[PDB]
Design a protein around this nucleic acid. Structure first.
Ligand SMILES: [K+]
Ligand SMILES: [K+]
Ligand SMILES: [K+]
Ligand SMILES: [K+]
Ligand SMILES: [K+]
Ligand SMILES: [K+]
Ligand SMILES: [K+]
Ligand SMILES: [K+]
Ligand SMILES: [K+]
Ligand SMILES: [K+]
Ligand SMILES: [K+]
Ligand SMILES: [K+]
Ligand SMILES: [K+]
Ligand SMILES: [K+]
Ligand SMILES: [K+]
Ligand SMILES: [K+]
Ligand SMILES: [K+]
Ligand SMILES: [K+]
Ligand SMILES: [K+]
Ligand SMILES: [K+]
Ligand SMILES: [K+]
Ligand SMILES: [K+]
Ligand SMILES: [K+]
Ligand SMILES: [K+]
Ligand SMILES: [K+]
Ligand SMILES: [K+]
Ligand SMILES: [K+]
Ligand SMILES: [K+]
Ligand SMILES: [K+]
Ligand SMILES: [K+]
Ligand SMILES: [K+]
Ligand SMILES: [K+]
Ligand SMILES: [K+]
Ligand SMILES: [K+]
Ligand SMILES: [K+]
Ligand SMILES: [K+]
Ligand SMILES: [K+]
Ligand SMILES: [K+]
Ligand SMILES: [K+]
Ligand SMILES: [K+]
Ligand SMILES: [K+]
Ligand SMILES: [K+]
Ligand SMILES: [K+]
Ligand SMILES: [K+]
Ligand SMILES: [K+]
Ligand SMILES: [K+]
Ligand SMILES: [K+]
Ligand SMILES: [K+]
Ligand SMILES: [K+]
Ligand SMILES: [K+]
Ligand SMILES: [Mg+2]
Ligand SMILES: [Mg+2]
Ligand SMILES: [Mg+2]
Ligand SMILES: [Mg+2]
Ligand SMILES: [Mg+2]
Ligand SMILES: [Mg+2]
Ligand SMILES: [Mg+2]
Ligand SMILES: [Mg+2]
Ligand SMILES: [Mg+2]
Ligand SMILES: [Mg+2]
Ligand SMILES: [Mg+2]
Ligand SMILES: [Mg+2]
Ligand SMILES: [Mg+2]
Ligand SMILES: [Mg+2]
Ligand SMILES: [Mg+2]
Ligand SMILES: [Mg+2]
Ligand SMILES: [Mg+2]
Ligand SMILES: [Mg+2]
Lengths: 91, 70, 50, 99, 49, 250
RNA sequence: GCCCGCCGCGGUGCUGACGCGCAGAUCGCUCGUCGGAGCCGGGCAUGGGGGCGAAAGACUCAUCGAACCGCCUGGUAGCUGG
RNA sequence: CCCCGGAGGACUGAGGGGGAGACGGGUUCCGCGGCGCCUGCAUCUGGCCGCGGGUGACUCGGGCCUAAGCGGCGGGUGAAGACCGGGAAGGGGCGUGCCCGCCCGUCGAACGGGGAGCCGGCGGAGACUCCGGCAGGCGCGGGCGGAGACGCGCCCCCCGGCGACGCGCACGGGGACCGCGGCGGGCGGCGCCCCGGCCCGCGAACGCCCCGCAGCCCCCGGACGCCUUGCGCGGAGAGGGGGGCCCGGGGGCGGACCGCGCGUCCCCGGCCGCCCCUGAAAAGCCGGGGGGCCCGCGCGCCGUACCGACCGCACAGGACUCCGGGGUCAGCAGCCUCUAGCGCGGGAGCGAACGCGGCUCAGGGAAGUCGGCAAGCCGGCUCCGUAACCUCGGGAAAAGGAGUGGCUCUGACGGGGUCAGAACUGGAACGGACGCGGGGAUCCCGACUGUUUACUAGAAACACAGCGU
């Protein structure tokens, strides 16, 4: 049976720190606890080990990524643009 | 005296700057005998004491008697 | 302390060695009336800093 | 009875190299016996896993035969790593000469 | 849970039950379906029948 | 008429020196040499590691010894997407891939770069913090200068033989999580410097600070101080063009 | 950096004891806290108009709105005593 | 005699008034003798006084290594004292003559790293140090097997390893401890009962053989399974069958009485969780690639006695760390206790006021007082039953009720206690000592945990996350 209605994993904080901070942390902490898909392993086993460091627990690659998620939107866009600029440098 | 009569060991005061090899050599050359092992300590007054065990085929009674130690 | 350097051991040893009274034959020989050696010390009320 | 014991080391500060166990002696007495730390065994230079075949003893106390394995890169690579290196070298030779 | 797992394991090995019945009951045990060993043995008879 | 204030005491060092114990070392680009200056050199990413006091991670990368036998170990600020066992390249002829080091003259307009040198060969000093980058804006060949955008948004001319690394720094988003507690701030600053917690000037006596004293806590004069004020006087807002919180900038 | 509670660490009230003291700050009962911005030991660093301070003008060896030691110095006093 | 002995009566109560170390003290240690001083009373006592004595190391520590640091460096600067510092033609192997080379400290830890020790005995005072026995370390002298995972002399350059590391609720294994019975040996009491009470029944380091869960690897082959308290794992090859390696451990033989249990402490194991925190270094020792080539003897220097005998002018203060039995119990709480140890400036008489620490009081119940200050009420466990408001997490033990002993039985869980139920019975009693919230309706201030005027102020003051310049 469901145990809380809204607070989710922020129920560890009790009544402290106010509503806006707890609302921000629910999102942040869910993101940083999630399992991600290993871009090499093929499997969903990547977990965070430090702020920007992600390890695949199956194939054991280590990767550099975001603070609280494996990929970031700026990096997605930058990688796409750099790939396009390379391809334009191939005649 | 118990130490000499059994355990075949004799007790001296020596110069504080003397090590175990020097002590063994000096006892051998002076008393014309055979040392086996040497223990040492410095007393609370600053003297050096040597426990000298002679060879298992020598009588400390006899060497100490020739000394005058009895 | 049970873990002391030889230099501190030797200076302590000299204090112990010299903490003594005037011999009686010395008193007779030198014709003394003062018979207490006032450079003696006792461990309970001393502050040897050696 | 009373089985309490006193410290065996020079000081009583209980660091990780000053750990003892307790044992009963033939004279009916409770004695303290030091518990040495156990060194790790060598690990793979490529993947960091324990090399198979070497006991967890400092090599100064092992005979020469006991400190080694019988393969090229015997104590340095785990064998999967050796296979991978051989394949890399040969196939790269093949793709660098003759296209 | 150790008592229930020991009994279910023995049967599957002896081939008293198949591997699929074994897995269905293993899950039901971890879900608190059985309060003791006797109730579990009766549920096995029924499934087998 | 007072004592020395807190900002005056930090310059001597003592308890205000950086906590550098168990740091991995200084992070740098590979030194420019003959082989990179004429061609390209190859390295392999060996590890990705966390550095004490630093938000972004570092990469330990191994190259061959180009003047002897053996190998050579380098520490890099890690671009996001770099991974253990990757092959990186460094030279005038390296390709356009995340993690490679190229002269900024050979890098096309529109590109994200990190760890950029402001003068050639100094080994990299711009856009080094987590999530930062520089854009390559334009090339002027005759003067042999490149125009870049710094993370503040300022524009700058640098030489075209200054080198950079392709990509953006990993660890981005770090500041979007609130510190919840005094304890989280305590741990964060314990990894860096003795700079925390902070006591306000108006909470002090006049001997300790120029904002101190009074029967109500209050500064007393304007807290905009001029640019040429002397040490001990230069507290508050230093040489402010304007103040207050109003919208509508750009 | 959750709650009751032992050692520990602290120090609320009795404006209790004591106040020619057990003591130049202690004792009894009661009380705050007890997984943490937690408590303890050793080594090391910062020196006087300087240091150090989650800020009380607090602390810097019973000394602090400027330590202690010797000297300048038998410092000067239209002021008190002889 | 407050000393010694015997008998009795008590206490400290395993976080000890016990047994031992680090620091500080420095001979306070031991034996014999003694009472001039001290031992705020006495003394035939003694840490006091006199006279003799006393601490033994290849294996314990220091010496070595490096930490945070500190010093040194052609020189640089300043009136000097001195302070500051890489840009300097900076040293080794050997064997002539060649060859290799960028530039510090045999300063800094008696808790970090660091080759190697166990048992029995002997003395007034020493022991991991002596003696006897049994070992270990470092030195010096007279190319093969397998299918495979794997099994069975050096020197230089480079690549590596060990040394070498955080926290946590659980779960698992070993050791020690602790209990319950059997059997052997010995006690004590005994008015009645008593095969029912008490004490003793011991096995080290080290060497050879076997045995070791988890975990990692090999072979076959190719998949709706395997599996934990929790998880976790598999075509990047599971399950099944057969193997390899590690495992601070256990057993057998040496060295040399018998079973069965819950629990506690310590270490270890595999996982899982956490971090804007990611949890030393070096000496020393070893491996890989490439290339060139049994028997004897010894192990130096320093510490080692004792003590909370230390600091507070001598003292209810202050003063780091080991080991940790039984009963009641949730328990390292309180209360009683085995082992061990037993001072605390002295006694006797009387039973006034007053005080200091305690106890009980009819009827009333805050009328007392600036003020319920002080005191008292409540309190364990199980069941029942719980409002406003709210940041939806709380409020909450809200408020309020009921039961609880002894004895004789019954049921449930795979030898072990727990949980549930019934009959009988006792002044109308039962958390019978001990331990242990009083509650509620509101207003002001500060969001919260935290900090502070050592010695008259703990707060509304400081800090804080957040916000802004
Ligand atoms: K001593
Ligand atoms: K003294
Ligand atoms: K002034
Ligand atoms: K000033
Ligand atoms: K000043
Ligand atoms: K100033
Ligand atoms: K100051
Ligand atoms: K601070
Ligand atoms: K502040
Ligand atoms: K002011
Ligand atoms: K307490
Ligand atoms: K107070
Ligand atoms: K009173
Ligand atoms: K007190
Ligand atoms: K608590
Ligand atoms: K300073
Ligand atoms: K100072
Ligand atoms: K001053
Ligand atoms: K002064
Ligand atoms: K003076
Ligand atoms: K002078
Ligand atoms: K003066
Ligand atoms: K005057
Ligand atoms: K005057
Ligand atoms: K006068
Ligand atoms: K006597
Ligand atoms: K000059
Ligand atoms: K100078
Ligand atoms: K040294
Ligand atoms: K050191
Ligand atoms: K240390
Ligand atoms: K040491
Ligand atoms: K270490
Ligand atoms: K190799
Ligand atoms: K000794
Ligand atoms: K009377
Ligand atoms: K009276
Ligand atoms: K009243
Ligand atoms: K009245
Ligand atoms: K009250
Ligand atoms: K109640
Ligand atoms: K009952
Ligand atoms: K406040
Ligand atoms: K708290
Ligand atoms: K507070
Ligand atoms: K006050
Ligand atoms: K106060
Ligand atoms: K308070
Ligand atoms: K207040
Ligand atoms: K304050
Ligand atoms: Mg010695
Ligand atoms: Mg103030
Ligand atoms: Mg001012
Ligand atoms: Mg708490
Ligand atoms: Mg509490
Ligand atoms: Mg005069
Ligand atoms: Mg004067
Ligand atoms: Mg008692
Ligand atoms: Mg004595
Ligand atoms: Mg007297
Ligand atoms: Mg040793
Ligand atoms: Mg050590
Ligand atoms: Mg002794
Ligand atoms: Mg360490
Ligand atoms: Mg001793
Ligand atoms: Mg009234
Ligand atoms: Mg507050
Ligand atoms: Mg005060």
């Amino acid at each position: 049976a469901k145990r809380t209605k809204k607070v989710g994993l922020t129920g560890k904080y009790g009544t402290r720190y106010g509503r806006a901070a707890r609302k921000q942390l629910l999102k942040i902490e869910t993101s940083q606890k999630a399992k991600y898909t290993c871009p090499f392993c093929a499997k969903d086993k990547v977990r965070r080990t430090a702020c920007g460091i992600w390890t695949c627990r199956s194939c054991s690659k280590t990767m550099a990524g975001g603070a609280y998620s494996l990929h970031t939107e700026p990096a997605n866009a930058a990688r796409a643009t750099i790939r396009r600029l390379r391809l334009a440098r191939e005649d | 005296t118990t130490q000499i009569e059994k355990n075949n060991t004799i007790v001296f005061i020596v110069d504080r700057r003397a090590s175990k090899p020097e002590i063994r050599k000096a006892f051998e050359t002076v008393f014309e005998t055979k040392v086996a092992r040497v223990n040492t300590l410095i007393t609370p007054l600053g003297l050096k004491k040597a426990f000298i065990r002679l060879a298992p085929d020598v009588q400390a009674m006899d060497v100490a008697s020739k000394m005058g130690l009895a | 302390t049970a873990n002391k350097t030889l230099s501190r051991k030797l200076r302590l040893a000299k204090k112990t060695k010299t903490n003594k009274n005037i011999p009686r034959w010395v008193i007779a020989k030198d014709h003394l009336k003062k018979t207490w050696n006032y450079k003696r010390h006792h461990w309970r009320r001393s502050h040897l800093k050696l | 009875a009373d089985c309490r014991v006193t410290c065996r080391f020079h000081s009583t500060y209980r660091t990780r190299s000053k750990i003892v166990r307790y044992k009963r002696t033939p004279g009916n007495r409770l004695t303290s016996l030091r518990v040495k730390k156990l060194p790790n065994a060598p690990h793979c230079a490529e993947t960091g896993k324990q090399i198979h075949g070497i006991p967890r003893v400092i090599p100064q106390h092992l005979t020469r035969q006991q400190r080694k394995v019988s393969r090229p890169y015997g104590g340095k690579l785990c064998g999967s790593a050796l296979r991978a290196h051989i394949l890399e070298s040969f196939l790269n030779e093949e793709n660098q000469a003759l296209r | 849970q150790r008592v229930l797992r020991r009994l279910l394991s023995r049967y599957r090995d002896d081939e008293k039950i198949d591997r699929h019945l074994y897995e269905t009951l293993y899950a039901k045990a971890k879900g608190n379906m059985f309060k003791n060993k006797r109730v579990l043995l009766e549920h096995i008879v029924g499934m087998q029948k | 008429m007072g004592r020395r204030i807190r900002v005056q005491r930090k310059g001597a060092g003592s308890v205000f020196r950086a906590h550098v114990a168990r740091r991995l070392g200084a992070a740098k680009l590979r030194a420019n040499d003959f082989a990179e200056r004429t061609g390209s050199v190859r390295g392999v990413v060996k590890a990705i590691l966390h550095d004490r006091g630093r938000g972004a991670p570092l990469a330990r990368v191994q190259f061959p010894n180009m003047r002897g036998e053996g190998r050579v170990n380098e520490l890099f600020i890690a671009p996001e997407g770099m991974y253990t066992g990757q092959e990186v390249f460094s030279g005038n002829k390296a390709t356009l891939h995340i993690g490679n080091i190229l002269p900024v003259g050979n890098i096309p307009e529109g590109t994200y770069v990190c760890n950029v040198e402001e003068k050639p060969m100094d080994r990299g000093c711009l856009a080094r913090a987590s999530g930062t980058y520089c854009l390559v804006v334009a090339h002027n060949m005759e003067t042999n200068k490149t125009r870049i955008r710094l993370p503040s948004g300022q524009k700058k001319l640098i030489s075209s033989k200054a080198r950079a690394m392709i990509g953006l720094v990993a660890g981005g988003g770090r500041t979007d999580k609130p510190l919840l507690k005094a304890g989280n701030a305590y741990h964060k600053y314990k990894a860096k410097r003795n700079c925390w917690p902070v006591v306000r000037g108006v909470a002090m006596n006049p001997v300790d600070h120029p904002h101190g004293g009074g029967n109500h806590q209050h500064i007393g004069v304007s807290s905009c101080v001029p640019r040429n004020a002397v040490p001990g006087q230069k507290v508050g807002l230093i040489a402010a063009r304007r103040t207050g919180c109003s919208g509508g900038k750009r």
